Design an enzyme around this catalytic site. Structure first.
Site, PDB file in Angstrom:
ATOM      1  N   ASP A 216       0.849  -1.172   0.000  1.00 40.41           N
ATOM      2  CA  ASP A 216       0.000   0.000   0.000  1.00 40.41           C
ATOM      3  C   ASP A 216       0.895   1.235   0.000  1.00 40.41           C
ATOM      4  O   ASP A 216       2.078   1.163   0.328  1.00 40.41           O
ATOM      5  CB  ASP A 216      -0.979  -0.043   1.169  1.00 40.41           C
TER       6      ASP A 216
ATOM      7  N   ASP B 254      -7.736  -7.503   0.803  1.00 39.63           N
ATOM      8  CA  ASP B 254      -6.827  -7.601   1.938  1.00 39.63           C
ATOM      9  C   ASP B 254      -7.592  -7.183   3.178  1.00 39.63           C
ATOM     10  O   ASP B 254      -8.462  -6.312   3.107  1.00 39.63           O
ATOM     11  CB  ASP B 254      -5.613  -6.667   1.816  1.00 39.63           C
TER      12      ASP B 254
ATOM     13  N   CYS C 122     -12.430 -27.965   8.065  1.00 39.11           N
ATOM     14  CA  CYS C 122     -11.235 -27.252   7.643  1.00 39.11           C
ATOM     15  C   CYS C 122     -10.081 -28.212   7.387  1.00 39.11           C
ATOM     16  O   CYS C 122      -9.844 -29.144   8.155  1.00 39.11           O
ATOM     17  CB  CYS C 122     -10.845 -26.291   8.753  1.00 39.11           C
TER      18      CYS C 122
ATOM     19  N   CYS D  49      -6.867 -27.291   7.351  1.00 41.33           N
ATOM     20  CA  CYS D  49      -5.588 -26.734   7.772  1.00 41.33           C
ATOM     21  C   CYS D  49      -4.872 -27.646   8.769  1.00 41.33           C
ATOM     22  O   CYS D  49      -5.457 -28.543   9.378  1.00 41.33           O
ATOM     23  CB  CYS D  49      -5.761 -25.318   8.323  1.00 41.33           C
TER      24      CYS D  49
ATOM     25  N   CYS E  85      -6.269 -27.761  12.376  1.00 41.78           N
ATOM     26  CA  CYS E  85      -7.464 -28.575  12.557  1.00 41.78           C
ATOM     27  C   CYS E  85      -7.181 -30.064  12.396  1.00 41.78           C
ATOM     28  O   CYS E  85      -7.991 -30.887  12.835  1.00 41.78           O
ATOM     29  CB  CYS E  85      -8.592 -28.083  11.650  1.00 41.78           C
TER      30      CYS E  85
ATOM     31  N   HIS F 157      -4.996 -21.038  11.408  1.00 38.71           N
ATOM     32  CA  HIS F 157      -6.314 -21.514  11.036  1.00 38.71           C
ATOM     33  C   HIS F 157      -7.116 -20.420  10.329  1.00 38.71           C
ATOM     34  O   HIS F 157      -7.768 -20.678   9.317  1.00 38.71           O
ATOM     35  CB  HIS F 157      -7.085 -22.034  12.247  1.00 38.71           C
TER      36      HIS F 157
END
Ligand SMILES: Nc1nc2[nH]cnc2c(=O)[nH]1
Ligand SMILES: Nc1nc2[nH]cnc2c(=O)[nH]1
Ligand SMILES: [Zn+2]
Ligand SMILES: [Zn+2]
EC number: 2.4.2.29
Lengths: 365, 365
Positions: free
Chosen positions: B92, B261, B299, B301, B304, B330
């Protein structure tokens, strides 16, 4: 199928030994350093702890019995499952940290009033599913009069017998875990001898030297180790509790210690101190702001493969969690690489030279 | 050998698009979510960020220009090397965060007085080695009168032209990076149109919708998106800055947004809020103290796969760094899985049904 507890000494040099402890959840290479874990080695996933070379970690009866609670951890499947570490865990017994004392045990208030006793400590460690259970002992203040050191040590020895009996009464615990006794006696040779004799008469899988993480300084610690370690059974592991700095470890191995735990690498790491073969450095110092070298240019850890001093300096100064993560991983890896060099040098009959070379460089800075 | 910047739309459904941006440092799958990174995505190693599925991260001119400084990062080899992320980074431009304004730029004091201008912002982003450079724009307060929104937007458009010229003057930057313009105009259709027209006349690689992360609420945000996104060139990416919650993202994709974002997954994660397909949960709540299920039972991930709600609840309540690490991993993984489901459903022509099913379940809780 695996052994409950089998210690084998592969090589010796002077009083130093190297070998292995085989347990059901894995092998522990000795001399060993145990990272200290509220059911976490701070800022590290268990897989990262293992990647540094650690074979075993330490957990604390005192903290876990309050948060989240021992029955709760047992209901959730035990400490190993709860935190995701499937290898051996040694649990300290709680009486030491918590320090109202009586022959029964210790009463205390949480930072609500609770009690700990040899029997309750063993039960808590059972509920956690510890692999190495520590006898419930008493903290002797330093300095202490000979008479107060004696009465404290004697109570600890009666508590050691109660710990042995409570452990042996729980057949699943006695079949799957090991029990270590803790020598006390402050700095007094005669009391250390009486303590060692009492512990050997009871019989333990391993023998800790307690009461030496108390601010006495390295010279005095080494003096006490000089006479205390030979009093313990040679054929079982010797565990120096709460020690220490890298040079403390090297000198303690020279005096017959096989196992160590200390918060220094984790706590120091979070507070910006990194261990290197040229001594500790404070990564927040301005001199590191543009230093593209890793924390240590001989370290094999993942942090030193990937990130510079300059970046870690920036993270720690910014209060970033990744800074604590990277410092802690490096420091624990440094400690494990120190232990590996100790083990290899004893095995190869060059530990005396290693210790001399290590000190010369570590203290040159 | 690789393209500087090539956007391709593979499939559409209504106003929604899915495709890819090819850049020198990697491919960005769209719609895309960019984790926000003081030269770190808080509590995550770059390899973990990548493991969640992220293709690109966001860095901030404003923070890095003060700590550690843009020239310093350049001397250390650029932001990618400094932080250990080798894939695309969008930076940015700094004017927005920092909010004394004048036609030249903005003067500000650090939390020492500094200045930012279009030219200096482009130079800073060049020194960082950004892949996607944002034009230097102005924050329009919300609410704003039409006249104040107009004068702010007009200054932003003059600054957008100055940003284009400064970027194009730096041949290495123009050859290796992309430049995005930022539409302003508050909530006013006529100003949004004038802004889009000015940006398209200058020409950019991508077009952001600025000024909608300002507390207007989702209904109003969607109303403005309804007319604003169609004003932008169809053949370039559309980036909604600073948005948002999972439902904000889904509805914005339905309105033609390709990139997002937001600090929510990282910041919320550290503060105990986990995103799930059944809505957010506060893991500190007592109801999770003995819950052996993972944060989300669908999930994919690593968190998890390995740890329970009960354990993470314990860590967060204890203030443990590992708690922040696990929650953040997560949450970022959840956001990436949301984006993957969005991309797949658009590709397969079933995004309308996905959005309906997603909202029904997410808001049932
Ligand atoms: N139980 C126990 N833990 C310790 N940790 C460090 N010293 C001691 C000690 O004497 N006893
Ligand atoms: N530069 C910039 N960044 C933003 N992030 C969120 N909104 C904005 C905006 O309008 N401009
Ligand atoms: Zn290292
Ligand atoms: Zn997950």
């Amino acid at each position: 199928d695996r052994p409950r507890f089998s210690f084998s000494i592969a090589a010796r040099e002077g009083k130093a030994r190297t070998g292995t402890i085989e347990m059901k959840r894995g092998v522990i290479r000795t001399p060993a350093f145990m990272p200290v874990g509220a059911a976490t080695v701070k800022a590290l996933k268990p897989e990262t702890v293992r990647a540094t070379g650690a074979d075993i970690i330490l957990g604390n009866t005192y903290h876990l019995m309050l948060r989240p609670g021992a029955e709760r951890i047992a209901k959730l499947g035990g400490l190993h499952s709860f935190m995701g570490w499937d290898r051996p865990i040694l649990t300290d017994s709680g009486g030491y940290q918590v320090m109202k004392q009586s022959e029964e045990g210790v009463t205390f208030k949480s930072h609500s009033r609770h009690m700990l006793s040899p029997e309750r400590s063993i039960e808590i460690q059972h509920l956690l599913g510890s692999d190495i259970v520590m006898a419930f002992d008493e903290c002797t203040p330093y300095p202490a009069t000979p008479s107060r050191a004696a009465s404290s040590m004697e109570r600890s020895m009666r508590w050691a017998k109660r710990s042995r009996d409570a452990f042996d009464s729980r057949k699943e615990q006695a079949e799957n875990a090991a029990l270590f006794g803790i020598q006390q006696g402050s700095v007094f040779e005669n009391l250390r001898q009486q303590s060692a004799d009492a512990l050997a008469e009871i019989g333990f899988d391993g023998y800790a030297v307690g009461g030496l993480a108390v601010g006495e300084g390295q010279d005095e610690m080494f003096r006490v180790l000089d006479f205390s370690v030979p009093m313990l059974p040679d054929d079982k592991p010797h565990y120096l509790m709460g020690v220490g700095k890298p040079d403390d470890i090297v000198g303690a191995v020279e005096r017959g210690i096989d196992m160590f735990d200390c918060v220094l690498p984790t706590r120091s790491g979070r507070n910006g101190q990194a261990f290197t073969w040229d001594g500790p450095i404070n990564i927040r110092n301005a001199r590191f702001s543009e230093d593209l070298k890793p924390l240590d240019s001989e370290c094999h850890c993942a942090v030193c493969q990937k990130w510079s001093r300059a970046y870690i300096h920036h993270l720690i100064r910014a209060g970033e969690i990744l800074g604590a993560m990277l410092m802690t991983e490096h420091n624990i890896a440094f400690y494990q690489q120190l232990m590996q060099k100790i083990r290899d040098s004893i095995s190869e009959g060059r530990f005396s030279q290693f210790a001399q070379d290590f000190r010369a460089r570590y203290f040159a800075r």
